[PDB]
């Protein structure tokens, strides 16, 4: 679940932030979206067709740059994205310009999530209910014998995961990011593997950057958005 509960007055503060971030973003939008220099630098740069966007394994803003309506939080939803209403931007030409426009719109959609989630926040527990996978609170483990036993064991040994394998993918803002973890049945993972989006984006670099000029080899790095914690680990 979550590490601990929110502080005492933060829900009233994210609202106060969002009220002004709505215009702080339109302001950044104005000197780039219809800048003719920013336009000419990225209009037919980095074009990927929708059929080889699948063959390269591209996802997120690069797959939706090419016209394909696919994102995980609508298609295979998780973590209370069912309960929150929003729409999705998808470009039409496979270029750096539509990959820019869908980010500038995903800003807006994320702000829509934030205000819907501040309005619809319920009460209740913030961690999972049982003390065999995460710790009791310190009010309890200092007087409860069971809870002191569970607190002592979840930190020395840890909890045990049942034996199995899973590939779980969510939508990072870079793209589809997944993890393939093999559980022995022990308290250490037998195997973990991170599928980073930017690994497949940088592997796809040769396929796109053929026949571009040298300056337009730099504007295409900034659309696959390589942070390099992703690409090598």
């Amino acid at each position: 679940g979550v590490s601990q509960d929110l502080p005492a007055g933060l829900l009233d503060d994210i609202y106060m932030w969002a009220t002004q971030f709505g215009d702080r973003l339109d302001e950044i939008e104005e000197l780039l979206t219809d800048n003719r220099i920013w336009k000419l630098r990225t209009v037919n740069i980095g074009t990927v067709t929708a059929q080889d966007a699948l063959n390269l394994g591209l996802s997120g803003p690069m797959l939706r740059g090419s016209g394909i309506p696919f994102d995980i939080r609508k298609n295979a939803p998780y973590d209370a994205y069912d309960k929150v209403d929003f729409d999705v931007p998808v470009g039409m030409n496979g270029d750096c310009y539509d990959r820019y426009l869908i980010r500038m719109a995903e800003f807006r959609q994320s702000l829509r999530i934030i205000e819907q989630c501040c309005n619809d926040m319920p009460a209740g527990a913030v961690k999972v209910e049982d003390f065999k996978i995460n710790s009791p609170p310190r009010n309890l483990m200092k007087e409860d014998m069971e809870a002191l036993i569970h607190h002592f064991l979840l930190y020395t040994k840890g909890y045990s995961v049942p034996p199995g394998e899973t590939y779980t993918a969510i939508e990072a803002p870079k793209g589809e990011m997944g993890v393939y973890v093999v559980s022995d049945g022990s308290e250490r993972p037998y195997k973990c593997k991170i599928r980073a989006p930017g690994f497949a984006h940088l592997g796809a670099f040769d396929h796109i950057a053929r026949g571009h000029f040298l300056p337009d080899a730099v504007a295409i790095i900034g659309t696959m958005d390589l942070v390099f914690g992703e690409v090598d680990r």
Partner: protein, 239 residues
């Protein structure tokens, strides 16, 4: 109409519950119907390619086809091209070594059909010396993935342009993600002042690595668990 006369929201009547009501339910119960669907789909695929599909496993919302190594290119082709499957996007391929098996590595392949919104896994096997055939013939995004599975595990992909190491040191001898390879490795780096270069030396630590895996449980922590195999896909008891 001012920023002086704007209302505060800290002074407000807020939500307050006496008591929270959350019903308890098994998370595996929401999958079951789709899991049954997945079973039927897999029983079709094995019936469609009996020469090439040794097995399958359905855990919970996740399908795995168990396929032999010389059987991988006829299966992936099928998964790319059949109108029912259409597993266009390569997602993630890698290896896992089980040193207790004869064929040490198993090589897993993850595919996404963005049409039908479905994932599939393909498992083959490989020894340290014997290859797996490469699917970079079909997928141009696969080869880097194959290449990473080369460097961390030593698994080969026959028919691969530019198989070499990636995300490791150039003169690195060893395959790191491998149970005989130690954690801290074999060598270390320092600046030799005499030769005015970095030298690579056998490894030595100022604090030795202390694993606390010695000291695990002596009681087996989880049961066998229940099944979500449907009654359609298990053998009938006689009478």
């Amino acid at each position: 109409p001012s920023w002086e006369n704007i209302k505060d929201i800290r002074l407000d009547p807020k939500v307050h519950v006496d008591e929270v009501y959350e019903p308890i339910v098994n998370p595996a119960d929401r999958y079951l119907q789709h899991v049954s669907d997945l079973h039927q789909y897999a029983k079709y695929i094995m019936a469609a390619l009996p020469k090439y599909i040794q097995g399958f496993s359905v855990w919970k919302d996740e399908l795995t086809l168990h396929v032999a190594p010389s059987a991988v290119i006829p299966v992936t082709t099928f998964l790319r091209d059949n109108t029912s499957t259409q597993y266009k996007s390569i997602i993630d391929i890698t290896a896992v070594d089980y040193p207790s098996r004869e064929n040490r590595f198993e090589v897993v392949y993850n595919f996404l059909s963005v049409r039908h919104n479905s994932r599939i896994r393909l498992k083959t096997y490989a020894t340290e010396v014997t290859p797996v055939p490469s699917i970079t013939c079909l997928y141009e995004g696969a080869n880097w993935f194959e290449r990473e599975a080369y460097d961390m595990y030593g698994v080969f992909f026959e028919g691969h342009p530019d198989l070499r190491r990636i995300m490791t040191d150039y003169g690195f001898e060893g395959h790191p993600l491998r149970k005989d390879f130690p954690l801290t490795g074999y060598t270390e780096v320092r600046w030799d002042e005499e030769k005015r270069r970095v030298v690579y030396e056998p490894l030595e630590l100022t604090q030795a690595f202390r694993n606390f895996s010695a000291g695990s449980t002596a009681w087996e922590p989880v049961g066998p668990g229940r099944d979500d195999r449907p009654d359609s896909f298990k053998l009938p008891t006689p009478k």
